[PDB]
Design a protein around this nucleic acid. Structure first.
Length: 408
DNA sequence: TTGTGCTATGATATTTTTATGTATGTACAACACACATCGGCGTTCCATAGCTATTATATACACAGCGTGCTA
């Protein structure tokens, strides 16, 4: 990819003594850039990752290059260990395993052999936006190499600590514009859209009488959000496109999941059921609407479903939802003549959550994506299958929300 | 004088996910007495070769049955 050689030209310029951060999309090949840099340096390279799936991907890249089984390419994890050799090495480690404090499973010595014997020379950190934390400062404080590299896709955080990475690892060298990359490769056009649904009177006065995170249980459970949600679901099913529903709250995800009758993936869920739901979403055309929480978004991103719906949201964590949204957008690439990606933000008027979703839309403006407002698409008035459209169901839902407030 | 409001820290309240020690399900073999071993056939059809009854004649000998005399 041209931008990858545009990033490698900086390494080809000076050669020795360099450190910086390279911003590349998730769908791009930053791991290939790490492989090329590993071929240019030829030394013990350590790749800092947070999940085993990324370790398996880096191992697949090592297989795409050459060798992995002979005593040279090592693997560090809490399950097994593998030997290494000087002058050339490729190993992937976990942040929580290298960090620690005093808990030990007779494996911290195996890491202190890679760090004690001084077999290093190249540092690779996956997702640098997570570095602003004490454990990563300890990791950097326990390592020292000749060349450092930071592979990440985003860096927008409101912790005011992203600027420290300019001296902890190095200043950002190349930031690729996702619009020009969309022109190089169709990574699904980004259509940002907020749905403005009216707010009922009872949920408005009860919403004002509530506060903190409890008023979210009155912002999400609005009947017009159920009507507009069903209208968007039936609309996308009529267009023949799969639907992914995001929710920062597990309770709302279970409510919409059970009322819509679709599979759901949330916390404390068996992994076999998660894999079954994933296979049903990949193969079965009857399941075109999935309800995914943060566990289903951080662990895996699927290239299907051009329809992304956002209902639940948390205060301040708008940039993280923009990063996950960006992961689902960049995950969809196949060079199509159309390829229209639709992001909907179900927001209710006069609520305290839309005013942060606007900050998320500001983050979506900083990336160059297109944003437009949507009050209501004509067609919901012709859907007799809408729930909570009658005053009876609205009063019953009001009583259910009041009971939910009495439980919390 | 006493009550009320913002900066900042202090503490208090949520959320996701790594491995870990204990629990649960499932193998394995296996220990040492409990026990074991040892000894100083019936039934039917076809080709085969022997084997059945008879006589003309002499000789001599034994065996079973019948016709006639005597007396009680």
């Amino acid at each position: 990819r041209p931008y990858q050689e545009k990033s490698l030209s900086k390494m080809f310029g000076n050669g020795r003594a360099r450190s910086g951060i390279i911003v590349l999309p998730c769908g791009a090949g930053k791991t290939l850039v790490g492989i090329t840099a590993a071929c240019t340096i030829k030394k013990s390279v350590i790749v800092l990752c947070t999940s085993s799936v990324s370790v398996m991907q880096w191992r697949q890249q090592f297989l795409x290059x050459x060798x992995x089984x002979x005593x040279x390419x090592x693997x560090x994890x809490x399950x097994x260990x593998x030997x290494x050799x000087x002058x050339x090495x490729l190993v992937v480690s976990t942040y929580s395993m290298v960090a620690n404090x005093x808990x030990x499973x007779x494996x911290x010595x195996x890491x202190x052999x890679x760090x004690x014997x001084x077999x290093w020379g190249f540092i690779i950190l996956d997702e640098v936006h997570v570095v602003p934390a004490a454990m990563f400062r300890r990791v950097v404080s326990t390592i020292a190499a000749h060349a450092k590299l930071g592979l990440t896709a985003t860096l927008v955080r409101e912790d005011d600590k992203i600027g420290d990475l300019n001296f902890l690892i190095g200043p950002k060298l190349y930031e690729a514009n996702w619009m020009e990359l969309s022109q190089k490769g169709h990574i699904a056009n980004v259509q940002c859209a907020e749905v403005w649904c009216p707010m009922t009177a009872e949920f408005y006065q009860e919403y004002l009488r509530e506060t903190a995170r409890k008023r979210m249980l009155l912002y999400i459970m609005n009947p017009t959000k159920f009507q507009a949600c069903q209208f968007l679901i039936q609309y996308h099913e009529r267009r023949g496109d799969k639907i992914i529903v995001f929710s920062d709250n597990v309770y709302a995800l279970q409510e919409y999941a059970l009322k819509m009758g679709k599979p759901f993936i949330y916390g404390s869920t068996p992994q076999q059921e998660r894999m079954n739901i994933l296979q049903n979403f990949q193969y079965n055309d009857q399941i075109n609407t999935i309800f995914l929480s943060k566990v289903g978004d951080t662990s895996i991103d699927l290239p299907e479903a051009t329809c992304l719906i956002q209902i639940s949201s948390h205060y301040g964590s708008r940039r993280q939802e923009a990063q996950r949204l960006g992961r689902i957008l960049r995950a969809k690439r196949r060079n199509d003549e159309g390829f229209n990606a639709f992001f909907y933000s179900l927001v209710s008027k006069d609520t305290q959550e839309m005013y942060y979703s606007t900050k998320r839309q500001a983050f979506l403006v900083d990336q160059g994506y297109a944003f437009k407002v949507i009050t209501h698409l004509h067609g919901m008035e012709n859907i007799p299958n809408l729930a909570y459209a009658s005053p009876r169901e609205r009063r019953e839902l009001l009583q259910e929300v009041l009971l939910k407030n009495e439980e919390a």
